[PDB]
Amino acid sequence: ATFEIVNRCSYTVWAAASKGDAALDAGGRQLNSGESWTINVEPGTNGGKIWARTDCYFDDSGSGICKTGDCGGLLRCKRFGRPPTTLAEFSLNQYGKDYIDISNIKGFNVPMNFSPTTRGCRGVRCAADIVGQCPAKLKAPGGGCNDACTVFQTSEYCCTTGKCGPTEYSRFFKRLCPDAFSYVLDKPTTVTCPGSSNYRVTFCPT
């Protein structure tokens, strides 16, 4: 499957793509404002994610740091990124269908649209100004809007037991972005697409 990753933000981002235990394609790349990077993701990939990273520095060997979404200091991510990270999430070729969503469970850094480029389903978007409107207690001094699990490490925010409900913090993310997951047990906003669809992830779509 192809994923065209497009940076419509006015600032550079470093895109990242991983399934948690391995890179997808090269795993990461710099995207200046307006640049597009097309990756290939193996069919059957389960639990893949794409995200933006901001305010990064890398040496010539591809080692460094980002202020949001850093994946072990690598340019080419092999693992998931450090919150806050708006997440484009997907599982491909799962019994004949693909499944896509956007999640704020690991916080929010950059607005994104995640849409198919092929027929048969709709896209999802979280493009509101979550960082600007972020509750004081969730603001990440390094940049972005943290989720409450990250900040407070409770059973209720992290849904550790599997019994949790919505919270005043999850409801903030849900208000700003109804079509993204706001906590682990949120009413799903997953879209079913045809198996082997292709996609575009756009940072700062609006």
Side-chain angles (χ1 to χ4, degrees):
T2 64
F3 288 70
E4 189 180 50
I5 306 174
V6 181
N7 182 18
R8 189 174 293 147
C9 308
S10 64
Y11 47 88
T12 301
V13 302
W14 289 260
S18 178
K19 65 178 186 75
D21 65 349
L24 306 173
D25 196 284
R29 210 203 80 173
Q30 188 173 323
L31 290 176
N32 295 332
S33 177
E35 295 192 323
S36 303
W37 177 38
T38 303
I39 67 166
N40 291 96
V41 174
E42 195 181 29
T45 291
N46 181 88
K49 304 191 194 300
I50 290 162
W51 68 104
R53 300 173 287 174
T54 60
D55 304 320
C56 306
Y57 296 91
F58 295 108
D59 72 15
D60 299 344
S61 81
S63 291
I65 188 164
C66 301
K67 296 197 179 179
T68 67
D70 190 72
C71 58
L74 302 181
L75 172 62
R76 292 183 171 166
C77 295
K78 287 163 28 170
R79 309 269 179 275
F80 296 138
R82 190 169 188 276
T85 53
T86 319
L87 296 169
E89 303 186 309
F90 47 90
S91 297
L92 308 182
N93 309 285
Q94 301 298 303
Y95 305 100
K97 294 293 179 182
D98 292 354
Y99 294 91
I100 66 170
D101 68 80
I102 293 171
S103 176
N104 290 136
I105 291 168
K106 296 289 177 176
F108 178 104
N109 64 160
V110 173
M112 52 163 312
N113 182 93
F114 181 18
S115 288
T117 55
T118 52
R119 293 171 167 179
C121 56
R122 69 169 188 98
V124 291
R125 185 180 287 196
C126 177
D129 186 13
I130 282 175
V131 180
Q133 302 295 6
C134 189
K137 288 178 169 266
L138 299 184
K139 288 176 186 262
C145 191
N146 288 310
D147 62 286
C149 172
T150 292
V151 175
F152 294 108
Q153 297 281 279
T154 69
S155 290
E156 191 66 14
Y157 296 138
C158 302
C159 212
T160 307
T161 67
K163 291 198 179 163
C164 62
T167 66
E168 186 211 58
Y169 296 128
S170 72
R171 286 186 190 90
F172 159 76
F173 288 96
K174 200 59 167 185
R175 179 173 63 86
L176 281 262
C177 282
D179 295 334
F181 285 86
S182 64
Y183 71 109
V184 168
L185 295 177
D186 208 348
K187 175 184 173 41
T189 47
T190 306
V191 172
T192 307
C193 289
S196 299
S197 296
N198 296 320
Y199 302 96
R200 181 180 287 118
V201 175
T202 305
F203 301 121
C204 302
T206 62

